[PDB]
């Protein structure tokens, strides 16, 4: 029967930013996760509730794929119970997370010698973000007392900071594309069961 759209997220040209992480709904598909192993050796293929080699033998109720790019050294923040700029302000994973994390280097695609400024990570936020939330607001952050009237000033700046990815940057500041596969394990009416 129908195959899965995994080719739309792994064989894509560009990924979304961290503050605007795109969620891809997967349903009514036979997920052959072997198509992911043939990709470049991932810096991190870590499943927190199952083993990556057992996915093809299980059924999943609702599986969603999240995509975004980070500076590499932040991959340690994409995991349950982590803290930091990303984990707190852009993408938060719950402590009860049941899924797999996939991260690989993209210094060839998402980096330029002049600097690619199309990726942002929302440096600052007023409150810490909750699991599976998205704050695409680009309003000015009021750090001082004076109400910021929409113009950057000595006490209110813009929250979105841009990455300056360049091939000359060493490992740790390079772009690492992260794919988070979240699926429910309980035996509810399934929509993705794999190749039998």
């Amino acid at each position, epitope marked *: 029967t129908n195959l899965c759209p995994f*080719h*739309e*997220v792994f*064989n*894509a*040209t*560009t*990924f*979304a930013s961290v503050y605007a992480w*795109n969620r*891809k709904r997967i349903s009514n598909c036979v997920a052959d996760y072997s198509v992911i192993y043939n990709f470049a050796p991932f810096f991190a293929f870590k499943c927190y509730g199952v083993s990556p080699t057992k996915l093809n033998d299980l059924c999943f109720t609702n599986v969603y*794929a999240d*995509s975004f790019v980070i500076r590499g050294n932040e991959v340690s923040q994409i995991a349950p119970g982590q803290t930091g700029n990303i984990a707190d302000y852009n993408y938060k994973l719950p402590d009860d997370f049941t899924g797999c994390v996939i991260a690989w280097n993209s210094n*060839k*695609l*998402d*980096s*330029k*010698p*002049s600097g690619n400024y199309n990726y942002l990570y929302r440096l600052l936020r007023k409150s810490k973000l909750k699991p599976f939330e998205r704050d695409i607001s680009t309003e000015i952050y009021q750090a001082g007392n004076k109400p910021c009237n929409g113009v950057a000033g000595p006490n209110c700046y813009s929250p979105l900071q841009s990455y300056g990815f360049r*091939p000359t940057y060493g490992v740790g500041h390079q772009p690492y594309r992260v794919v988070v596969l979240s699926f429910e394990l309980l035996h509810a009416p399934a929509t993705v069961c794999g190749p039998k």
Partner: antibody
Amino acid sequence: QMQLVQSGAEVKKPGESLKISCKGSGYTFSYYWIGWVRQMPGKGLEWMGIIYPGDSDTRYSPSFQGQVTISADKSISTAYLHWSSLKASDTAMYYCARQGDLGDWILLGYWGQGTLVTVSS
Amino acid sequence: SALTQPPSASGSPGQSVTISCTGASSDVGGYNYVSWYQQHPGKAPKLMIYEVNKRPSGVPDRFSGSKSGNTASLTISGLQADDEADYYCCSYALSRVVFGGGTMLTVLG
């Protein structure tokens, strides 16, 4: 100044090897994707593949997987396109392109003069 | 997928014309991975439009682009004799560029 210069016109016969080149200067020939494009007489453009001169990572189009190979000599800043056992259908204009400082990584903002390849018995 | 374009288009000087492109695919990042190239007879193409809401420098503002669903449009405001060329659309979403059959732009008069 940035410019791409390609080998001259090549006239061959079927069953013969060919290796055209396209040399780039005025920019770093290690961080830009270089590729080749086919345009047959009166037909449109056909994309064959790209490569990363830094580390040789070749991305071929499904219609040109084993029919042609792409390589680069990072030391002399030149990209190549190698054929084996040419066919009468391979006669066409072959361009080289590279991504520009703007856009995505396969946008192909800069092009070459174009290399004319003709093969006839 | 493969893109489709009209075999030819026609327009008189001063008027405007539009070129349609159907078949543009998409990925997770977004939808508009659309670009347009101009090729005069006897020389290599040139990037006219990329990221249809954008265009490179050195290109007159007469060239505009848009997208409504899987249909992309190339709008030329003022026509001139030096506009006759083959215009191709390119979809580069799934790490694969697909060029359309192209359309011949011939100016009347």
